[PDB]
């Protein structure tokens, strides 16, 4: 009958042959993201609307400019109270509004924005579709797995047991075409990141940090050739309890092997396309401890793999 053929299509349409490892990975990151929000939110995230988020972000812009202007705190409070009414927090209420606070508030909003988009169509598939990216599982039997494992396990300064559990292929749609392949020195590197932020990274890609008048080579996208250095970036997850890490074909081309730090770099130095923090080596004076490759463009990156791993602890 009419309604039955419809539901027959629904079961067929919704039955997307997907690997269970991807499903569990997708379910984790979105549960992890939700977990980070509910760690410091009174109001559930589902109750929050798109309107409140747009408003929230708007209020911050005024508060940001107000601090640089040099207003009294009294005025900052009343503005921020309206912000907190749209997005309720819990615990102590930051009473001191600084550049740093606003940056974190902005990040929180952006996560909440994503959580509203995904929530609408099962919960598993909707979360996959929301990323708008092709995530595939790779078997251990395949020889691709051994390549990726080895590329990870080469530059290992620290000697902690590395448990490479799950490896997934990944690649954004609009990134691949826009990626600067023609630019020279296209080598893969490791990007350390917390599990909570992954949902956003898979959606929008690696974006440039908002400048603050944390990084020692300016506001750019940081990478490393070493894994041990990336462990300090990528903390363990809350939901599953496993570190995630993105391997990306970073086109760094000409790279300046700087010894000294430089925080004023909004973009790359003149004549070169990247900056290489030169790690502290037998007898060469560098402030940089870790190997830090940095680019200052969204289209100088192309993510390839996602490494699910865990430390002894």
mmCIF file of C-alpha atoms in Angstrom:
data_model
loop_
_atom_site.group_PDB
_atom_site.id
_atom_site.type_symbol
_atom_site.label_atom_id
_atom_site.label_comp_id
_atom_site.label_asym_id
_atom_site.label_seq_id
_atom_site.Cartn_x
_atom_site.Cartn_y
_atom_site.Cartn_z
ATOM 1 C CA UNK A 1 0.000 0.000 0.000
ATOM 2 C CA UNK A 2 1.069 3.673 -0.098
ATOM 3 C CA UNK A 3 2.567 4.016 3.445
ATOM 4 C CA UNK A 4 4.259 0.557 3.343
ATOM 5 C CA UNK A 5 6.454 1.135 0.221
ATOM 6 C CA UNK A 6 7.526 4.384 1.893
ATOM 7 C CA UNK A 7 8.733 2.554 5.014
ATOM 8 C CA UNK A 8 10.325 -0.166 2.859
ATOM 9 C CA UNK A 9 12.415 2.601 1.275
ATOM 10 C CA UNK A 10 13.191 4.006 4.741
ATOM 11 C CA UNK A 11 14.687 0.710 5.960
ATOM 12 C CA UNK A 12 16.701 0.407 2.726
ATOM 13 C CA UNK A 13 17.825 4.060 2.711
ATOM 14 C CA UNK A 14 18.801 4.046 6.398
ATOM 15 C CA UNK A 15 20.647 0.704 6.150
ATOM 16 C CA UNK A 16 24.009 2.227 5.181
ATOM 17 C CA UNK A 17 26.669 -0.525 5.249
ATOM 18 C CA UNK A 18 29.175 1.252 7.526
ATOM 19 C CA UNK A 19 31.968 -0.330 9.579
ATOM 20 C CA UNK A 20 31.343 -0.722 13.319
ATOM 21 C CA UNK A 21 34.741 0.829 14.123
ATOM 22 C CA UNK A 22 33.699 4.043 12.345
ATOM 23 C CA UNK A 23 30.274 3.972 14.020
ATOM 24 C CA UNK A 24 31.915 3.678 17.456
ATOM 25 C CA UNK A 25 34.463 6.385 16.570
ATOM 26 C CA UNK A 26 31.680 8.688 15.335
ATOM 27 C CA UNK A 27 29.578 7.938 18.428
ATOM 28 C CA UNK A 28 32.572 8.675 20.685
ATOM 29 C CA UNK A 29 33.627 12.080 19.338
ATOM 30 C CA UNK A 30 30.043 13.401 19.386
ATOM 31 C CA UNK A 31 29.463 11.944 22.861
ATOM 32 C CA UNK A 32 32.833 13.420 23.877
ATOM 33 C CA UNK A 33 31.874 16.823 22.446
ATOM 34 C CA UNK A 34 28.515 16.696 24.246
ATOM 35 C CA UNK A 35 30.365 15.596 27.399
ATOM 36 C CA UNK A 36 32.682 18.630 27.283
ATOM 37 C CA UNK A 37 29.700 20.994 27.020
ATOM 38 C CA UNK A 38 27.721 19.346 29.839
ATOM 39 C CA UNK A 39 30.872 19.541 32.002
ATOM 40 C CA UNK A 40 30.107 23.254 32.508
ATOM 41 C CA UNK A 41 26.517 23.952 31.418
ATOM 42 C CA UNK A 42 23.340 24.177 33.512
ATOM 43 C CA UNK A 43 20.923 24.145 30.568
ATOM 44 C CA UNK A 44 21.052 20.999 28.348
ATOM 45 C CA UNK A 45 22.540 21.556 24.890
ATOM 46 C CA UNK A 46 19.391 20.388 23.066
ATOM 47 C CA UNK A 47 17.397 23.246 24.638
ATOM 48 C CA UNK A 48 19.856 25.804 23.215
ATOM 49 C CA UNK A 49 18.826 27.243 19.836
ATOM 50 C CA UNK A 50 20.650 28.787 16.866
ATOM 51 C CA UNK A 51 19.335 32.231 17.864
ATOM 52 C CA UNK A 52 20.938 32.156 21.328
ATOM 53 C CA UNK A 53 24.318 31.151 19.858
ATOM 54 C CA UNK A 54 24.317 33.945 17.258
ATOM 55 C CA UNK A 55 23.352 36.430 19.987
ATOM 56 C CA UNK A 56 26.025 35.087 22.348
ATOM 57 C CA UNK A 57 28.824 35.506 19.791
ATOM 58 C CA UNK A 58 27.588 39.034 19.033
ATOM 59 C CA UNK A 59 27.781 40.105 22.692
ATOM 60 C CA UNK A 60 31.400 38.936 22.974
ATOM 61 C CA UNK A 61 32.548 41.135 20.067
ATOM 62 C CA UNK A 62 31.418 44.231 21.991
ATOM 63 C CA UNK A 63 33.023 42.995 25.224
ATOM 64 C CA UNK A 64 36.270 42.323 23.332
ATOM 65 C CA UNK A 65 36.387 45.867 21.934
ATOM 66 C CA UNK A 66 35.322 47.281 25.318
ATOM 67 C CA UNK A 67 38.349 45.759 27.079
ATOM 68 C CA UNK A 68 40.749 47.205 24.490
ATOM 69 C CA UNK A 69 38.984 50.566 24.890
ATOM 70 C CA UNK A 70 39.519 50.390 28.663
ATOM 71 C CA UNK A 71 36.018 50.471 30.167
ATOM 72 C CA UNK A 72 35.107 49.871 33.812
ATOM 73 C CA UNK A 73 34.340 46.318 34.960
ATOM 74 C CA UNK A 74 30.821 47.324 36.062
ATOM 75 C CA UNK A 75 29.822 47.718 32.398
ATOM 76 C CA UNK A 76 31.516 44.452 31.374
ATOM 77 C CA UNK A 77 29.493 42.583 34.018
ATOM 78 C CA UNK A 78 26.056 43.716 32.820
ATOM 79 C CA UNK A 79 26.941 42.742 29.237
ATOM 80 C CA UNK A 80 28.290 39.339 30.297
ATOM 81 C CA UNK A 81 25.242 38.626 32.485
ATOM 82 C CA UNK A 82 23.074 38.880 29.353
ATOM 83 C CA UNK A 83 25.511 36.484 27.658
ATOM 84 C CA UNK A 84 25.195 34.014 30.550
ATOM 85 C CA UNK A 85 21.384 34.275 30.429
ATOM 86 C CA UNK A 86 21.415 32.899 26.868
ATOM 87 C CA UNK A 87 24.144 30.333 27.631
ATOM 88 C CA UNK A 88 23.993 29.370 31.369
ATOM 89 C CA UNK A 89 27.263 28.270 32.999
ATOM 90 C CA UNK A 90 27.816 26.502 36.332
ATOM 91 C CA UNK A 91 30.441 26.828 39.062
ATOM 92 C CA UNK A 92 32.149 30.142 39.857
ATOM 93 C CA UNK A 93 31.191 32.969 37.478
ATOM 94 C CA UNK A 94 34.381 34.481 35.905
ATOM 95 C CA UNK A 95 34.045 37.995 37.338
ATOM 96 C CA UNK A 96 37.325 39.028 35.665
ATOM 97 C CA UNK A 97 36.662 39.353 31.928
ATOM 98 C CA UNK A 98 39.903 39.194 29.924
ATOM 99 C CA UNK A 99 40.931 38.474 26.322
ATOM 100 C CA UNK A 100 41.440 34.817 27.271
ATOM 101 C CA UNK A 101 37.951 34.289 28.715
ATOM 102 C CA UNK A 102 36.218 35.624 25.594
ATOM 103 C CA UNK A 103 38.258 33.289 23.378
ATOM 104 C CA UNK A 104 37.097 30.275 25.405
ATOM 105 C CA UNK A 105 33.499 31.548 25.435
ATOM 106 C CA UNK A 106 33.682 31.824 21.636
ATOM 107 C CA UNK A 107 34.930 28.233 21.337
ATOM 108 C CA UNK A 108 32.115 26.993 23.592
ATOM 109 C CA UNK A 109 29.514 28.669 21.364
ATOM 110 C CA UNK A 110 31.002 27.156 18.207
ATOM 111 C CA UNK A 111 30.740 23.664 19.719
ATOM 112 C CA UNK A 112 27.132 24.330 20.770
ATOM 113 C CA UNK A 113 26.408 25.493 17.209
ATOM 114 C CA UNK A 114 27.578 22.131 15.835
ATOM 115 C CA UNK A 115 25.547 20.202 18.431
ATOM 116 C CA UNK A 116 22.355 21.921 17.228
ATOM 117 C CA UNK A 117 23.093 21.075 13.572
ATOM 118 C CA UNK A 118 23.599 17.339 14.168
ATOM 119 C CA UNK A 119 20.481 16.984 16.350
ATOM 120 C CA UNK A 120 17.498 16.428 14.033
ATOM 121 C CA UNK A 121 17.414 9.764 10.503
ATOM 122 C CA UNK A 122 19.186 7.632 13.187
ATOM 123 C CA UNK A 123 21.630 9.178 15.736
ATOM 124 C CA UNK A 124 24.550 7.204 14.265
ATOM 125 C CA UNK A 125 24.108 8.174 10.604
ATOM 126 C CA UNK A 126 23.102 11.783 11.305
ATOM 127 C CA UNK A 127 26.394 12.213 13.190
ATOM 128 C CA UNK A 128 28.341 10.782 10.227
ATOM 129 C CA UNK A 129 26.504 12.975 7.697
ATOM 130 C CA UNK A 130 26.990 16.030 9.945
ATOM 131 C CA UNK A 131 30.785 15.772 9.581
ATOM 132 C CA UNK A 132 30.424 15.846 5.776
ATOM 133 C CA UNK A 133 33.563 13.745 5.312
ATOM 134 C CA UNK A 134 34.538 10.246 4.159
ATOM 135 C CA UNK A 135 35.787 8.229 7.147
ATOM 136 C CA UNK A 136 36.675 4.611 6.299
ATOM 137 C CA UNK A 137 38.074 1.813 8.480
ATOM 138 C CA UNK A 138 41.382 0.081 7.708
ATOM 139 C CA UNK A 139 42.044 -3.548 8.684
ATOM 140 C CA UNK A 140 45.231 -4.734 10.409
ATOM 141 C CA UNK A 141 45.631 -7.444 7.747
ATOM 142 C CA UNK A 142 46.071 -4.786 5.039
ATOM 143 C CA UNK A 143 49.590 -3.547 4.268
ATOM 144 C CA UNK A 144 48.373 0.073 4.347
ATOM 145 C CA UNK A 145 47.989 -0.305 8.128
ATOM 146 C CA UNK A 146 51.646 -1.298 8.567
ATOM 147 C CA UNK A 147 52.779 1.705 6.495
ATOM 148 C CA UNK A 148 50.786 4.193 8.586
ATOM 149 C CA UNK A 149 51.874 2.519 11.839
ATOM 150 C CA UNK A 150 55.541 2.707 10.818
ATOM 151 C CA UNK A 151 55.322 6.345 9.667
ATOM 152 C CA UNK A 152 53.960 7.123 13.149
ATOM 153 C CA UNK A 153 56.570 4.972 14.921
ATOM 154 C CA UNK A 154 59.888 6.343 13.645
ATOM 155 C CA UNK A 155 60.705 9.704 15.239
ATOM 156 C CA UNK A 156 60.028 8.507 18.793
ATOM 157 C CA UNK A 157 62.131 10.551 21.232
ATOM 158 C CA UNK A 158 60.264 9.292 24.304
ATOM 159 C CA UNK A 159 60.151 5.515 24.812
ATOM 160 C CA UNK A 160 56.644 4.887 26.140
ATOM 161 C CA UNK A 161 54.607 1.864 24.871
ATOM 162 C CA UNK A 162 52.535 3.023 21.881
ATOM 163 C CA UNK A 163 49.282 1.098 21.377
ATOM 164 C CA UNK A 164 48.029 1.747 17.835
ATOM 165 C CA UNK A 165 44.428 0.518 18.124
ATOM 166 C CA UNK A 166 42.400 1.815 15.165
ATOM 167 C CA UNK A 167 43.418 3.709 12.018
ATOM 168 C CA UNK A 168 40.925 5.440 9.713
ATOM 169 C CA UNK A 169 41.259 7.063 6.296
ATOM 170 C CA UNK A 170 39.871 10.611 6.134
ATOM 171 C CA UNK A 171 39.562 13.477 3.645
ATOM 172 C CA UNK A 172 37.358 16.578 3.410
ATOM 173 C CA UNK A 173 35.457 17.297 0.191
ATOM 174 C CA UNK A 174 36.206 20.977 -0.469
ATOM 175 C CA UNK A 175 39.696 20.785 1.083
ATOM 176 C CA UNK A 176 41.277 18.353 -1.403
ATOM 177 C CA UNK A 177 40.594 20.537 -4.458
ATOM 178 C CA UNK A 178 41.567 23.794 -2.715
ATOM 179 C CA UNK A 179 44.697 22.202 -1.194
ATOM 180 C CA UNK A 180 47.986 23.646 -2.477
ATOM 181 C CA UNK A 181 49.451 20.529 -4.109
ATOM 182 C CA UNK A 182 51.475 22.602 -6.593
ATOM 183 C CA UNK A 183 53.352 24.175 -3.662
ATOM 184 C CA UNK A 184 56.505 22.158 -2.971
ATOM 185 C CA UNK A 185 57.631 20.088 0.028
ATOM 186 C CA UNK A 186 54.396 18.123 0.479
ATOM 187 C CA UNK A 187 55.237 15.834 3.415
ATOM 188 C CA UNK A 188 52.915 14.220 6.029
ATOM 189 C CA UNK A 189 53.065 15.287 9.687
ATOM 190 C CA UNK A 190 51.239 14.590 12.959
ATOM 191 C CA UNK A 191 48.729 17.054 14.429
ATOM 192 C CA UNK A 192 48.027 16.669 18.152
ATOM 193 C CA UNK A 193 44.510 17.593 19.297
ATOM 194 C CA UNK A 194 42.036 16.728 22.124
ATOM 195 C CA UNK A 195 39.188 14.307 21.394
ATOM 196 C CA UNK A 196 36.462 16.902 22.055
ATOM 197 C CA UNK A 197 37.642 19.183 19.226
ATOM 198 C CA UNK A 198 37.729 16.380 16.623
ATOM 199 C CA UNK A 199 34.050 16.783 15.679
ATOM 200 C CA UNK A 200 34.816 20.380 14.661
ATOM 201 C CA UNK A 201 38.092 19.536 12.916
ATOM 202 C CA UNK A 202 36.349 16.919 10.745
ATOM 203 C CA UNK A 203 33.591 19.429 9.915
ATOM 204 C CA UNK A 204 35.406 22.681 9.135
ATOM 205 C CA UNK A 205 39.022 21.481 8.893
ATOM 206 C CA UNK A 206 42.044 22.860 10.753
ATOM 207 C CA UNK A 207 41.373 26.595 11.126
ATOM 208 C CA UNK A 208 43.689 29.438 12.161
ATOM 209 C CA UNK A 209 43.720 30.361 15.906
ATOM 210 C CA UNK A 210 42.152 33.676 16.941
ATOM 211 C CA UNK A 211 44.971 36.103 17.765
ATOM 212 C CA UNK A 212 45.339 37.374 21.343
ATOM 213 C CA UNK A 213 47.189 40.627 22.084
ATOM 214 C CA UNK A 214 49.641 29.933 23.584
ATOM 215 C CA UNK A 215 51.646 29.332 20.386
ATOM 216 C CA UNK A 216 55.361 30.200 20.294
ATOM 217 C CA UNK A 217 55.376 30.570 16.488
ATOM 218 C CA UNK A 218 52.403 32.930 16.160
ATOM 219 C CA UNK A 219 48.765 32.120 15.385
ATOM 220 C CA UNK A 220 49.076 29.169 12.995
ATOM 221 C CA UNK A 221 48.369 25.451 12.588
ATOM 222 C CA UNK A 222 51.001 23.503 14.547
ATOM 223 C CA UNK A 223 52.268 20.030 13.622
ATOM 224 C CA UNK A 224 55.142 17.701 14.529
ATOM 225 C CA UNK A 225 57.146 14.879 12.936
ATOM 226 C CA UNK A 226 57.624 13.271 16.362
ATOM 227 C CA UNK A 227 54.811 11.362 18.089
ATOM 228 C CA UNK A 228 56.112 11.873 21.646
ATOM 229 C CA UNK A 229 55.662 15.633 21.176
ATOM 230 C CA UNK A 230 52.092 15.091 19.920
ATOM 231 C CA UNK A 231 51.195 13.109 23.069
ATOM 232 C CA UNK A 232 51.461 16.316 25.131
ATOM 233 C CA UNK A 233 48.928 17.966 22.796
ATOM 234 C CA UNK A 234 46.464 15.064 22.577
ATOM 235 C CA UNK A 235 45.129 14.237 26.055
ATOM 236 C CA UNK A 236 43.124 11.006 26.701
ATOM 237 C CA UNK A 237 39.381 10.940 26.002
ATOM 238 C CA UNK A 238 36.633 10.998 28.643
ATOM 239 C CA UNK A 239 34.113 8.685 26.948
ATOM 240 C CA UNK A 240 36.271 5.857 25.574
ATOM 241 C CA UNK A 241 39.702 6.735 26.992
ATOM 242 C CA UNK A 242 41.831 6.875 23.835
ATOM 243 C CA UNK A 243 43.946 9.622 22.249
ATOM 244 C CA UNK A 244 43.167 10.789 18.709
ATOM 245 C CA UNK A 245 45.725 12.305 16.326
ATOM 246 C CA UNK A 246 45.481 13.533 12.723
ATOM 247 C CA UNK A 247 48.099 12.766 10.075
ATOM 248 C CA UNK A 248 47.946 15.472 7.395
ATOM 249 C CA UNK A 249 49.818 16.195 4.157
ATOM 250 C CA UNK A 250 51.067 19.643 5.197
ATOM 251 C CA UNK A 251 52.452 21.623 2.259
ATOM 252 C CA UNK A 252 55.099 23.673 4.150
ATOM 253 C CA UNK A 253 57.320 24.309 1.068
ATOM 254 C CA UNK A 254 60.148 26.770 1.852
ATOM 255 C CA UNK A 255 60.556 26.527 5.641
ATOM 256 C CA UNK A 256 62.459 28.927 7.910
ATOM 257 C CA UNK A 257 64.546 27.020 10.467
ATOM 258 C CA UNK A 258 64.167 29.624 13.225
ATOM 259 C CA UNK A 259 65.989 29.296 16.554
ATOM 260 C CA UNK A 260 64.385 32.221 18.406
ATOM 261 C CA UNK A 261 60.661 32.440 19.191
ATOM 262 C CA UNK A 262 58.346 34.884 17.400
ATOM 263 C CA UNK A 263 54.765 35.472 18.568
ATOM 264 C CA UNK A 264 53.942 38.409 16.268
ATOM 265 C CA UNK A 265 53.643 36.146 13.200
ATOM 266 C CA UNK A 266 49.990 36.445 12.173
ATOM 267 C CA UNK A 267 51.138 34.899 8.882
ATOM 268 C CA UNK A 268 54.296 33.196 7.581
ATOM 269 C CA UNK A 269 57.644 35.112 7.427
ATOM 270 C CA UNK A 270 58.705 36.964 4.219
ATOM 271 C CA UNK A 271 60.049 34.715 1.449
ATOM 272 C CA UNK A 272 59.083 31.408 3.099
ATOM 273 C CA UNK A 273 55.867 29.388 3.382
ATOM 274 C CA UNK A 274 56.371 27.884 6.860
ATOM 275 C CA UNK A 275 58.374 27.960 10.097
ATOM 276 C CA UNK A 276 60.227 24.979 11.588
ATOM 277 C CA UNK A 277 60.781 25.189 15.345
ATOM 278 C CA UNK A 278 64.160 23.433 15.395
ATOM 279 C CA UNK A 279 64.167 21.045 18.366
ATOM 280 C CA UNK A 280 66.909 21.261 20.998
ATOM 281 C CA UNK A 281 69.735 19.164 19.528
ATOM 282 C CA UNK A 282 73.156 18.062 20.800
ATOM 283 C CA UNK A 283 74.741 21.613 20.825
ATOM 284 C CA UNK A 284 72.416 24.040 18.872
ATOM 285 C CA UNK A 285 70.819 26.986 20.679
ATOM 286 C CA UNK A 286 67.031 26.800 20.277
ATOM 287 C CA UNK A 287 64.244 27.714 22.712
ATOM 288 C CA UNK A 288 62.019 25.135 20.988
ATOM 289 C CA UNK A 289 62.034 21.740 22.719
ATOM 290 C CA UNK A 290 59.650 19.929 20.358
ATOM 291 C CA UNK A 291 59.788 19.819 16.557
ATOM 292 C CA UNK A 292 57.127 22.335 15.496
ATOM 293 C CA UNK A 293 56.141 22.752 11.844
ATOM 294 C CA UNK A 294 53.773 25.710 11.418
ATOM 295 C CA UNK A 295 51.728 27.012 8.481
ATOM 296 C CA UNK A 296 49.427 30.047 8.440
ATOM 297 C CA UNK A 297 46.847 29.040 5.815
ATOM 298 C CA UNK A 298 43.738 26.836 5.820
ATOM 299 C CA UNK A 299 44.520 25.436 2.362
ATOM 300 C CA UNK A 300 48.107 24.445 3.241
ATOM 301 C CA UNK A 301 46.727 21.358 5.017
ATOM 302 C CA UNK A 302 45.070 18.143 3.831
ATOM 303 C CA UNK A 303 44.081 15.570 6.460
ATOM 304 C CA UNK A 304 44.688 11.931 5.516
ATOM 305 C CA UNK A 305 44.434 9.620 8.539
ATOM 306 C CA UNK A 306 43.117 9.518 12.113
ATOM 307 C CA UNK A 307 45.187 7.546 14.637
ATOM 308 C CA UNK A 308 43.294 6.106 17.611
ATOM 309 C CA UNK A 309 45.906 5.231 20.246
ATOM 310 C CA UNK A 310 46.277 4.922 24.030
ATOM 311 C CA UNK A 311 49.122 5.406 26.521
ATOM 312 C CA UNK A 312 49.943 3.001 29.428
ATOM 313 C CA UNK A 313 48.038 5.234 31.862
#
